[PDB]
Design an enzyme around this catalytic site. Structure first.
Site, PDB file in Angstrom:
ATOM      1  N   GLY A   1      -3.335  -5.064  27.358  1.00 37.85           N
ATOM      2  CA  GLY A   1      -4.711  -5.506  27.526  1.00 37.85           C
ATOM      3  C   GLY A   1      -5.604  -4.387  28.054  1.00 37.85           C
ATOM      4  O   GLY A   1      -6.629  -4.065  27.454  1.00 37.85           O
TER       5      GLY A   1
ATOM      6  N   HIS B   1      -3.590  -1.382  38.399  1.00 42.15           N
ATOM      7  CA  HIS B   1      -2.451  -2.121  37.865  1.00 42.15           C
ATOM      8  C   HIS B   1      -1.130  -1.501  38.332  1.00 42.15           C
ATOM      9  O   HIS B   1      -0.066  -2.097  38.146  1.00 42.15           O
ATOM     10  CB  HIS B   1      -2.558  -2.273  36.339  1.00 42.15           C
ATOM     11  CG  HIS B   1      -3.516  -3.332  35.870  1.00 42.15           C
ATOM     12  ND1 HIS B   1      -3.581  -3.745  34.555  1.00 42.15           N
ATOM     13  CD2 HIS B   1      -4.420  -4.080  36.521  1.00 42.15           C
ATOM     14  CE1 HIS B   1      -4.503  -4.691  34.428  1.00 42.15           C
ATOM     15  NE2 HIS B   1      -5.027  -4.910  35.610  1.00 42.15           N
TER      16      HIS B   1
ATOM     17  N   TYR C   1      -2.796   1.696  34.264  1.00 40.75           N
ATOM     18  CA  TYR C   1      -1.380   1.615  34.596  1.00 40.75           C
ATOM     19  C   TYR C   1      -0.811   2.996  34.925  1.00 40.75           C
ATOM     20  O   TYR C   1       0.386   3.223  34.757  1.00 40.75           O
ATOM     21  CB  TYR C   1      -0.575   1.015  33.440  1.00 40.75           C
ATOM     22  CG  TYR C   1      -0.879  -0.421  33.092  1.00 40.75           C
ATOM     23  CD1 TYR C   1      -2.070  -0.780  32.479  1.00 40.75           C
ATOM     24  CD2 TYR C   1       0.038  -1.430  33.346  1.00 40.75           C
ATOM     25  CE1 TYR C   1      -2.346  -2.096  32.136  1.00 40.75           C
ATOM     26  CE2 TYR C   1      -0.223  -2.752  33.010  1.00 40.75           C
ATOM     27  CZ  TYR C   1      -1.420  -3.090  32.400  1.00 40.75           C
ATOM     28  OH  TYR C   1      -1.704  -4.397  32.049  1.00 40.75           O
TER      29      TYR C   1
END
Ligand SMILES: Cc1cc2nc3c(=O)[nH]c(=O)nc-3n(C[C@H](O)[C@H](O)[C@H](O)COP(=O)(O)OP(=O)(O)OC[C@H]3O[C@@H](n4cnc5c(N)ncnc54)[C@H](O)[C@@H]3O)c2cc1C
Ligand SMILES: Cc1cccc(C(=O)Nc2ccc(NC(=O)c3ccc([N+](=O)[O-])o3)cc2)c1
Lengths: 273, 273
Positions: A149, A161, A155
């Site tokens: 997403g 994240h 990330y």
């Protein structure tokens, strides 16, 4: 090089990028003389839940039910549910295994997390004797390919994240390596809801290139079970001479074997260690 | 202290330790004047899969389907599937949320991983503006309570199964904190296939003790989103002044925010940080 494979699409759509990646995977392996088994999960409206109706014959104990115990029994005789048994002989056949799916809620969709449970039964997939690199599927290789997403910067090691090695340990070690698989590097196709139309072909192309010499890759590093105390009295801890070797060393071994130290970053993403 | 709660059993059996833990949870909260909602999943033979039949009315785009997009639309109007909508008003009601389940394949069973997906829809559960501690459910607390196959020494820092903080980040941060929840410490009832008959009451007792002053607990430490670049041009990275503060510091912040450094161990298990 092996003459067989297995792909597992885990998205409802056949329009999705996941489907295209699967059809790209299919055509790629088909082009190299590999057999390509396909367990298109949503197409075979697959069963993701574990009720007692996985086992065919009489329940050994239908008062209190350990699914762990009642499943293991059912395999060795040969009267499980045959939609489990059908999928099992694909794995016995397939040298390579490719999981194509979206990351929804920091993990694999529900319908694959039911596939993993019902198919990977004790004795067949894992044993509490034959564990990890000694495990049943140790002469096989497995790969992940994900559709995210958020973007790749989210990330990162310091994105909101958090790390991506962290989100892959539960899966790549905890499932695949636990059965035996020599887990090859994953395919991290990030933020696909933004990507241009042409760059949604560059990705599909680089995938097919990679799949050519896929068996000849070197897999990810997991602290082998040759370094551990495989008996449940010491506590299944790491061997005691090997503990002293790593106390002069700076990093961990894996993500889960951080050892409260540095994580050798991209442990679950790059292989050179 | 809040006047409401929600429990979610995720085991087929009603003989299981999970059921007893749920019934122990039920009787515990009922004894303190809390309302106790129960979404016994297997009892309500719950739907774990996402087909296009979550949305009631016409599909906005029935050629190519983004479930992400078509779900968010369906919430705000008010024509989702009402077994999703029913479960949603329990969350709007419930201050506390308890997830009782077995760890099978280094994570939550399939039937809960469908619950998470279908219920936690955008706008409702999460936003890509209102993220993490700013998120919708930020005035709520959530807890995990797990029943493990292996022992507690196996999931130590140097057991073959690796760390347990590592297996809880995908869930406790990546799901609960991402929606808002102030995630309290989890209940790690290990290896239950071995435990004596009496020590399977000591556990059920210590649970009820804990649930009394549960709201007055202090939650786990997650690097707050006040420390991050909440725009997708810099790359959603961590703020640049805060990066320099932690380069003189020895540990990370969370597990995913290890920063390639020491993990402040029991980040996802103990709270004092
Ligand atoms: C496919 C599969 C994969 C797995 N993979 C892993 C893995 O990778 N790693 C791992 O560690 N484990 C793994 N497991 C094991 C898993 O963790 C176990 O299933 C689980 O942890 C054991 O709890 P249970 O809920 O299954 O058992 P339960 O049914 O809860 O059994 C507990 C026992 O306690 C009794 N009991 C105690 N108190 C009470 C009470 N008050 N009332 C009634 N009964 C009570 C019950 O009657 C029962 O006999 C796997 C299992 C399966 C099936
Ligand atoms: C262009 C196109 C067309 C059809 C299909 C596709 C596709 O596979 N989309 C897609 C893109 C992304 C995800 N994953 C997420 O959206 C997602 C949800 C929640 C999170 N999360 O909180 O980490 O990530 C799923 C499907 C793309």
């Amino acid at each position: 090089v092996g003459r067989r494979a297995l792909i597992v699409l885990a998205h409802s759509e056949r329009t999705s990028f996941n489907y295209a990646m699967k059809e790209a995977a299919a055509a790629a392996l088909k082009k190299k003389g590999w057999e390509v088994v396909e367990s298109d999960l949503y197409a075979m409206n697959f069963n993701p839940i574990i009720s007692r109706k996985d086992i065919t014959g009489k329940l050994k104990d239908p008062a209190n039910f350990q699914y762990p115990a009642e499943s293991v029994l059912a395999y060795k005789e040969g009267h499980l549910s045959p939609d489990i048994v059908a999928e099992q002989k694909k794995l016995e056949a397939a040298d390579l295994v490719i999981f194509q799916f979206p990351l929804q809620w920091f993990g694999v969709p529900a319908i694959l997390k039911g596939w993993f449970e019902r198919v990977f039964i004790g004795e067949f997939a894992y044993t509490y004797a034959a564990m990890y690199d000694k495990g049943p599927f140790r002469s096989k290789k497995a790969v992940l390919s994900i559709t995210t997403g958020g973007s790749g910067s989210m990330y990162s090691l310091q994105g909101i994240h958090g790390d991506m090695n962290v989100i892959l340990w539960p899966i790549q070690s905890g499932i695949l390596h636990f059965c035996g698989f020599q887990v090859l590097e994953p395919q991290l196709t990030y933020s696909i809801g933004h990507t241009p139309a042409d760059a949604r072909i560059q990705i599909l192309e680089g995938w097919k290139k990679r799949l050519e010499n896929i068996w000849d890759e070197t897999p990810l590093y997991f602290a082998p079970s040759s370094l551990f105390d495989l008996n449940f009295q010491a506590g299944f801890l790491m061997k005691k001479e090997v503990q002293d070797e790593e106390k002069n060393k700076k990093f961990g071994l894996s993500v889960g074997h951080h050892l409260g130290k540095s994580i050798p970053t991209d442990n679950q993403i790059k292989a050179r260690k």
